[PDB]
């Protein structure tokens, strides 16, 4: 009994010793192992889930319904089919904006987080061997800053002026570079600029609420689809806005009635 | 702490951040003093564990163990 | 003893880590 | 540099392991 | 700081301790 | 990276040298002890 305790303690101290040596043995390899770099997710193993844009509250819709012979397409029958999954439940992005706001629930492709992990990266090759992580390189910083875009929106919106466009487009390159443009170059710049200004001219004209503005609204939705899909000036449902405008006019009429007969009782 | 901010929302995220924020805090901790800390620290900590175990072992042992051409001169005498 | 004093003042927070683990393990054993 | 360091490490690990095993057996002798 | 979750996962973390 | 990789190599080298010293000292001590035990019995007579 005493010899066994002495032996097991004298073996335990040396077991502690060899385990401790193995700790440093793994530790030396621990700072020369790095995460394998990809080109989709840059090794971060996550990109913004584009099918929900990162918001996550995607709209849902019933596409087809296998109705029983003898029923009417009501709403409760559709719900009962949803209980037994006899209707085609489909996911619509919140990027598509609809006239009727559909139920916005969590996106199954990202489980509500808003990102997809890089499935191209595989578990067998998730680690690298390079000691690049210790010496902070110029190329990683330049790459992580190459996806920052230097967002130019602060000049593109301010650019819509003939004198200011003249300055920015022509005068600044001619002064800084010390060169002079050919007339073909200047005229092509001016033509492409005037061609680009069509959408903002039409947006300004449709913003007047002048009579017959739905025709210019359809012109806006015809000239460029993607931008017109997000412009807040364009209304999805025209009778909606028109009758709400008439209702607001009669509402301020009755508001005037209230605010004018409220002053005839204290006298 | 936010989890796995994926790749490319930041230029949109900083679109709102920069308008709400009043003061950002940026930490500067390099890698090499951290790694020097790892190696020296695991050395000293594991030697501390070894010292505690060997002291306990030696004390408990010093307490418990005392309780336990070849026929010439052989032919004429 | 002096180089030991330097090495222990050097790594104070990690030593406190390990001592905290030792105390917690001892109280869990008892 | 990394390859040289890894080689030195492998030699050191083998030497330490065999030295500690021999020390264990030899202190078990006494 | 660069902790290693098993199956070979490297996670960068905050400063120290 | 060099000064980052240095201390682990150095501490493992001290571990190796300490283990070598302990093993060699124990080897000499056990050799002389076993020879002395044999020499009480088989050599010239003893004290
Ligand atoms: Zn990737
Ligand atoms: Zn999603």
CB contact under 8 A, B54 and A28: no
Q: Which residues surround ligand 1, an ion (CB under 5 A)?
A: A 38, 40-41, 118, 121
**Resolution of this deposited model, Å:** 3.3
Which distant-in-sequence residues (6+ apart) come within 8 Å of A148 by Cβ? B10, B11
CB-based contact (8 Å) between A24 and chain D?
A: no
Strands E3-5 and A58-65: what pairing? unpaired
CB contact under 8 A, A9 and B56: yes
Q: What's the CA angle centered on F12, arms F11 and F14, to 5 degrees?
A: 65
Q: Which approach determined this entry?
A: cryo-EM
Kindly give the distance from the C-alpha atom of residue A37 to the centroid of ligand 1, in angstroms, as a whole number: 7
What does R_g of chain B's alpha carbons equal in angstroms?
37
Q: Which two tokens stand for residue B7?
A: 């790749």
Cβ contact A20:D17 at 8 Å:
no
CA distance A42 to chain D (A): 24
Kindly list the residues from chain F whose CB atom is less than 8 angstroms away from the CB atom of residue D27.
Answer: 26
- Name the residue among A89, A234, F24, C20 with its Cα closest to residue D23: F24
- Name the residue among B67, F35, F30, F23 with its Cα closest to residue A5: B67
Q: In DSSP terms, which residues pair with A92 in a beta bridge?
A: A59
Known binding-site residues of A for Zn(2+) equal 38, 40-41, 49, 52, 107, 110, 118, 121
Helix, strand or coil, per DSSP, at residue A243: helix
- Name the residue among A227, A218, A225 with its Cα closest to residue A200: A227
From CA A92, how far away is CA A102, in angstroms rounded?
9
Q: Which of A17, A28, A131 lies at the smallest CB-CB distance from D9?
A: A28
C-alpha E1, offset from chain centre: 5
Name the residue with tokens 């303690």.
A9
Q: Which two tokens stand for residue A78?
A: 């559709």
Q: In DSSP terms, which residues pair with A34 in a beta bridge?
A: A128
Kindly list the residues from chain B whose CB atom is less than 8 angstroms away from the CB atom of residue A147.
Answer: 7-8, 11
DSSP characters over B4-38: ---SS-HHHHHHHHHHH-S--------SHHHHHHH
Cβ contact A62:A75 at 8 Å:
no
Kindly list the residues from chain C whose CB atom is less than 8 angstroms away from the CB atom of residue E17.
Answer: 13-14, 17
Which distant-in-sequence residues (6+ apart) come within 8 Å of A101 by Cβ? A59
CB contact under 8 A, C18 and B49: yes
Cβ contact A258:A241 at 8 Å:
no
Handedness of CA F20, A14, B56, C13 (dihedral sign): positive
Q: Which of F1, F5, F8 lies at the smallest CB-CB distance from A24?
A: F8
Strands A127-128 and A87-92: what pairing? unpaired
Kindly list the residues from chain E whose CB atom is less than 8 angstroms away from the CB atom of residue B1.
Answer: 14
């Amino acid at each position: 009994i005493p010899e066994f305790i002495s032996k097991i303690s004298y073996l335990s101290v040396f077991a502690v010793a060899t385990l401790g040596t193995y700790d440093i043995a793994l530790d030396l390899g621990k700072k020369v192992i790095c995460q394998r770099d990809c080109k989709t997710c840059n090794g971060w193993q996550a990109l913004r889930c584009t099918m929900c844009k990162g918001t996550g509250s995607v709209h849902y819709q019933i596409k087809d319904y296998n109705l029983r012979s003898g029923e009417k397409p009501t709403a409760d029958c559709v719900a009962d089919a949803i209980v037994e999954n006899r209707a085609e439940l489909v996911h619509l992005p919140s990027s598509f904006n609809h006239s009727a706001p559909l139920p916005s629930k969590d996106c199954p492709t990202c489980d509500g987080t808003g990102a997809m992990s890089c499935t191209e990266c595989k578990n067998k090759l998730q680690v690298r061997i390079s000691a690049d992580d210790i010496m902070e390189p110029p190329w990683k910083a330049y790459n992580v800053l190459k996806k920052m875009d230097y967002p130019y929106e602060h000049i593109v919106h301010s650019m819509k002026d003939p004198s200011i466009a003249n300055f920015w487009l022509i005068t600044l390159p001619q002064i800084v570079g010390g060169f002079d443009y050919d007339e073909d170059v200047k005229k092509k710049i001016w033509w492409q600029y005037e061609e680009s200004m069509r959408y903002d001219q039409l947006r300004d004209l449709v913003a007047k609420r002048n009579p017959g503005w739905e025709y210019l609204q359809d012109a806006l939705v015809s000239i460029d689809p993607v931008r017109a899909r997000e412009d807040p000036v364009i209304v999805k449902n025209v009778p909606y806005y028109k009758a709400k405008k008439s209702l607001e006019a009669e509402s301020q009429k009755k508001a005037q009635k209230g605010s004018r007969q409220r002053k005839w009782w204290f006298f | 702490i936010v989890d796995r901010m994926p790749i490319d929302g930041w230029n949109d995220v900083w679109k709102k951040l920069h308008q709400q924020i009043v003061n950002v805090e940026v930490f500067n901790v390099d890698v090499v003093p951290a790694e020097v800390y790892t190696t020296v620290a695991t050395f000293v900590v594991w030697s501390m564990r070894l010292a505690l175990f060997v002291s306990l072992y030696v004390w408990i042992d010093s307490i418990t163990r005392p309780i336990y051409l070849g026929s010439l001169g052989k032919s004429r005498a | 003893w002096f180089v030991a004093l330097g090495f222990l003042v050097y790594a104070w927070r990690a030593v406190l880590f390990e001592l905290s683990n030792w105390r917690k393990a001892a109280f869990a054993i008892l | 540099l990394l390859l040289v360091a890894g080689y030195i490490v492998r030699t050191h690990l083998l030497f330490v392991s065999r030295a500690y095993s021999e020390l264990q057996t030899e202190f078990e002798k006494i | 700081l660069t902790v290693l979750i098993k199956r070979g996962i490297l996670i960068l973390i905050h400063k120290k301790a | 990276v060099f000064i980052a990789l240095l201390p682990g190599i150095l501490i493992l080298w001290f571990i190796r040298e300490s283990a070598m010293l302990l093993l060699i000292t124990s080897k000499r001590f056990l050799y002389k002890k076993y020879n002395q035990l044999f020499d009480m019995a088989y050599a010239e007579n003893f004290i």
